Design a binder for these strands. Structure first.
Ligand SMILES: COc1c(N2C[C@@H]3CCCN[C@@H]3C2)c(F)cc2c(=O)c(C(=O)O)cn(C3CC3)c12
Ligand SMILES: COc1c(N2C[C@@H]3CCCN[C@@H]3C2)c(F)cc2c(=O)c(C(=O)O)cn(C3CC3)c12
Ligand SMILES: [Mg+2]
Ligand SMILES: [Mg+2]
Lengths: 198, 482, 485, 194
DNA sequence: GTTGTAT
DNA sequence: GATCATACAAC
DNA sequence: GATCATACAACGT
DNA sequence: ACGTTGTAT
């Protein structure tokens, strides 16, 4: 088996607790809300095949942002750097570092928000990744949890439950992103007023 | 590789997660309740301060104490947010009627932030006590906290119309709210007017409630927008600064501004004015020196050639703002764009429920005490026989049963008789109990009468509201023009 | 300008302010009191947790609440300092015997910080309860808090020698303390030893207290430094990583670091080693993997063939923190002044403090028992002459005259009479008297016992020994740090 | 007075361009900065925050001294210049007041600031420009601060006067010097514990 | 940009 | 402690 | 929430 | 001259 040998320069982000493997068909990358969950993930993850990337705060909604703002933001930049895929006119899916990208947002509502933003980013600027079926979402039973709990409940493949993100139709998808995330407020308010049970 | 895997449609998870976040932000974060005019963080701060015993009579407690208790018990979020809220509830230029009284640096009008929590202490304001009046008399429904090991009020009694009085803001998901502050007395007059004549209109209401009363003061231009606002829930009004052009000892002009509009920074206006000055837009000005003290408020001097033109420019450049009424509040779980009448009616009904619930609590308490007192009176009337029964008994159970059989008592009465101190077996003690009992009878009669008559409840509301108006209301700060 | 302008000489104000800050840091921030081995912040976190009711039995409470209370009531500094202190006393690799149980991200050995206070909750560890045991029996003095509206303990009871056992550090002004952690059972054995044979030499003490026992373990080189330290308070010893040489399935040597020294970061060692390797200042290294799992430490340095793993190992011991030094500077506050203490002096201080605590406790219990017995006598007389009592009461208008006549008649005190007047009617049953009698007799026995204990120092000493033995029985560890020559 | 319109991040300046009346208050942290600035009479009084414990220059290298941003901010505000530019006749404030917190850490910061001033702003202290405020500090209303320690017609101030410069240099070399032992001896001698 | 509850 | 990005809606 | 500079002693590199 | 340790600004 081929493994890393330390020593390497790599030039990967200052965060990112990378794994000890080099096989982009066994390794995983957990996107994590803050270093509060970052520590728990990093210290109890089987550091042979599981990497941890802390995204800080609410990631930029690309639908409501200029491309000049997108290419400027360093969080998305760090994510793309961690994937080593490339941006837009350089996006090579057959040159990724992880074929299993787990979205491990917090279990609160703001976590759902971050998950949403991340999904927009992934569908709008990492589309082949979702198309190839690399994007997974963790389904917990995070900073308020121990190492052993985090692992034994959510990260151990022998006892964890995960979801593969698979698109149905690209039309309905694009429309949904254009509604929930697009700058158009009124249709979104209509959606929330017609599809919410208080 | 996983053992147990499941498929997840993109649009599905997107929809579910988004609806979750949106709903949670609308009905539990960004918007206030129409009844008490509070959003979760503020309500939790007021209640947290209540349980902490930082009432206006008691001395202050450090901000870290309050923030700590509030986060640990009720508000499952960060320190900075809670403390920011508390600070905003203690600034004269933010809240028209401050709900928090604090010591130490709590920020200035000029954008300066508050000092750290380890330097500032705080307690409730005198008027916030009205928000918390008779909370301990089952006037308000409670719920388990996030940890489900504490309990917190869903709403507050709010004995003054906090929503209209202190206003609201702002941004949520798919919607936002904006309500200006109002003079206490006028809002109370409006409530009383709605209670007296239900067939009232918007104009009639505007007779005693001219418009917004901003903590900074200043002026409002026009009234049509105000009427459209109070009538429809959404409108637009223009705001301008309160100024005066004095005369120097050199014999020149001197345009001095004394009152800046709502949510307007004098410092930022200074910076922007200078920025516009080094761009040949505003000529004539000699020097712009901010001369505000801790006793009051900003001098802008001009030269020969024109002060009126220059000030008109200084107003048409930035000094002049647009308030957009979008009175949106949570009502019965769902959010709504409410008129003036709807807010007023909601608050009135809430007040009726509070007063009625309180009266019921007092009723029950009084009646129970009366029952026990009947028991005790019987006991003192048959002291020797009672003590005979008690002594003859071996265990307190058969004693209780024997007392209940002999003197025809309830379990509560017999229990109270058994739990009687010896020192209350004196002579003058019986009479005192009799007096307390009679007073209790009168009380119960009065409360039952109150519960049998809605008119009395309404009158109680009006009286107490009038007392709040007398105790706390300020003179009008904002002058309305046309 | 001004009006009232005083004049200050530079050297004067300098010396004054500096003496101020210095003394403040020395006596109330940087150095621990020898008796309980605690700094003000840790003592305030423990006492604050006690008053919070987050004892071992009771469930956890949010960290921000604990720190909020500690700050507001006792510790007038940053929230960050308090939370950091607590988090530190919750870490097994930082505290030889943790004084705090935590939940959630409380940090890692790799140097990762703890989670924000709005995620983590905490409480007392089962052993800290011994640090606080019998706090409510006047075993310890109290003083006003900074706000002068609360009260705090000057020192804690500390029913285990926390200073030596947990160690201390460090930096003051003009001084700096450094004490290594020790094994519980061993330190207790040394304490009992000194208690029994007071003419014991340092060697005799080392026969049961061989030396430091660090939370991570590792190895110690040079026991001479240990003896010199225990005899003087100052001394230097060597610490080396517990390592072993393996063989890959491919046939070449492999260095396996399993235990790192005290206060040494694994990750920092990894980085230092990498920087040393990609600089050719160290040669022969094939790989550097960190294989530590949440059940053990495994730091792997794989060597190429035709290269000695021993040379690489010793070069790592020389160039990296895989081998470091420890400088015993056993310094602690005693009698309000900073002192450099020998082992025997520290042990003596602890034993004295312990005697004070035990004697105080016994006195408290005696006073309480005697009071309750007095009141019980009153109640006995009343419950005997109930008719007469009730008659005197009924024939009384004021309560003052009732009390006065009860006292005058039954020859009682004011307290007793007040107790009689406060009697519930249900206490006049037939089966109530006998219970009070039994309780009274038991109280007599107890008072006799406690009086005997206060009369004899030997019984105090013995009690200390036995309770120490129980603490050790309940909490002691197996040794981790191997001492070798 | 000035005229504004002209081109540190902190430093709430005054209004009068007169280094004979104007005063610079060195206050610690934006927590004290808020109150001090809120009640300060913005004509002849400006405030300068000193975030964190200032660098001990008696133990630091010139490379690190010139690097420190706080010292650079104090020298920028004072408008004196540094080293071979220390033009005392170009100072911007007639009174450099040390207004540290009323705790021991505040006294420490007072010592540090006094070392900085004595060592690298010697003409300023040698000409009676340096003062020490006398509070009875973020735990204070702006009106409280103004009425107590910032009002000229009231308040008490200490004028930092230097006697024997040899004694000064000695004490500075002893307390804030590189050597630790004399500091330990001084602590052992001039301190009453119990 | 800025407003205020949030990560 | 101070200082940094950003979601969200509405000028 | 994450990072950033500093006092202070003592040792190291 | 730097780093590194733990309570502080
Ligand atoms: C502004 O001071 C601090 C700095 N800095 C000092 C430097 C100069 C100014 C700006 N840049 C840096 C930031 C820092 F890096 C950390 C902390 C810090 O952790 C802390 C705390 O209570 O935990 C408190 N303070 C303040 C109470 C002193 C810190
Ligand atoms: C790292 O997130 C935050 C940022 N940043 C977001 C940026 C993106 C990545 C690089 N770091 C910057 C700094 C910020 F500027 C402010 C706050 C903040 O004020 C705050 C709070 O509770 O008051 C909480 N957080 C918590 C979400 C962690 C903040
Ligand atoms: Mg924030
Ligand atoms: Mg800090």
């Amino acid at each position: 088996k081929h493994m890393k040998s330390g020593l390497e320069i790599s030039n990967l982000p200052g965060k990112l607790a990378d794994c000890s493997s080099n096989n982009p068909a066994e390794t995983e990358l957990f996107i994590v809300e803050g270093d509060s969950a970052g520590g728990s993930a990093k210290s109890g993850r089987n550091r042979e095949f599981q990497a941890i990337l802390p995204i800080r705060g609410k990631i930029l909604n690309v639908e409501k942002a200029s491309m000049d703002k997108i290419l400027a933001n360093e969080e998305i930049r760090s994510l793309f750097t961690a994937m080593g895929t490339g941006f837009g006119a350089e996006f090579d899916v057959s040159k990724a570092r992880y074929q299993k990208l787990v979205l491990m947002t917090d279990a609160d509502v703001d976590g759902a928000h971050i998950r949403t933003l991340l999904l927009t980013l992934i569908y709008r600027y990492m589309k082949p990744i979702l198309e190839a079926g690399y994007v997974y979402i963790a389904q917990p039973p995070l900073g308020e949890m121990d190492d052993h709990q985090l692992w034994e409940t959510t990260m151990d493949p022998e006892h964890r439950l995960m979801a593969r993100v698979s698109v149905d139709d690209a039309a309905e998808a694009d429309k949904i992103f254009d509604m929930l995330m697009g700058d158009r407020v009124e249709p979104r308010r209509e959606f929330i007023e017609e599809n919410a049970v208080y | 590789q996983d053992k147990n895997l499941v498929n997840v449609n993109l649009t599905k998870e997107m929809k579910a997660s988004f609806i979750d976040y949106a709903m949670s932000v609308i009905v539990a974060r960004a918007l206030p309740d129409v009844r008490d005019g509070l959003k979760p963080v503020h309500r939790r701060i007021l209640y947290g301060m209540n349980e902490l015993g930082v009432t206006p009579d008691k001395p202050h407690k450090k901000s870290a104490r309050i923030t700590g208790d509030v986060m640990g018990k009720y508000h499952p979020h960060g320190d900075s947010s809670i403390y920011e809220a508390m600070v905003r509830m203690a600034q004269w230029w933010s809240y028209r009627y401050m709900l928090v009284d604090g010591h130490g640096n709590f920020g200035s009008m000029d954008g300066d932030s508050a000092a750290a929590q380890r330097y500032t202490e705080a307690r409730m304001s005198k008027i916030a006590l009205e928000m918390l009046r008779d909370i301990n008399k089952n006037t308000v429904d409670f719920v388990d906290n996030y940890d489900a090991n504490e309990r917190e009020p869903l709403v507050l009694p709010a004995r003054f119309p906090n929503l209209l009085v202190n206003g609201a803001t702002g941004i949520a998901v798919g919607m936002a709210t904006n309500i200006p502050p109002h003079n206490l007395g006028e809002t109370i007059d409006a409530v009383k007017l709605v209670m007296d004549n239900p067939e009232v209109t918007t104009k009639d209401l505007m007779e005693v409630l001219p418009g917004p009363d901003f903590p900074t003061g200043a002026l409002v231009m026009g009234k049509s927008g105000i009427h459209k606002a109070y009538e429809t829930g959404k409108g637009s009004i223009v705001l301008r600064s309160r100024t005066e052009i004095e005369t120097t000892k050199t014999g020149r002009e001197r345009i001095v501004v004394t009152e800046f509009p709502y949510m307007v920074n004098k410092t930022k206006v200074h910076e922007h004015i200078v920025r516009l000055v080094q761009e040949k837009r505003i000529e004539g000005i000699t020097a712009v020196r901010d001369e505000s003290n801790r006793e009051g408020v900003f001098v802008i001097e001009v030269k020969r050639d024109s002060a009126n033109v220059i000030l008109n420019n200084l107003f048409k450049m930035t000094m002049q703002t647009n308030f957009g009424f979008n009175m949106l509040a949570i009502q019965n779980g769902i959010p709504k764009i409410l008129s003036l009448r709807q807010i007023l009616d909601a608050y009135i009904e809430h007040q009726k429920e509070v007063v009625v619930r309180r009266t019921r609590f007092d009723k029950e308490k009084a009646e129970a005490r009366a029952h026990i007192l009947e028991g005790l009176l019987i006991a003192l009337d048959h002291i020797d026989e009672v003590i005979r029964i008690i002594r003859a008994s071996e265990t307190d159970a058969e004693a209780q049963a024997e007392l209940m059989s002999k003197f025809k008592l309830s379990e509560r009465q017999s229990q109270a008789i058994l739990d009687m101190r010896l020192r209350r077996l004196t002579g003058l003690e019986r009479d005192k109990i009799q007096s307390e009992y009679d007073d209790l009878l009168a009380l119960i009669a009065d409360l039952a009468d109150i519960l049998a008559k809605p008119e009395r409840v309404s009158q109680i509301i009006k009286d107490e509201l009038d007392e709040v108006k007398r105790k706390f209301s300020d003179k009008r700060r904002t002058e309305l023009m046309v």
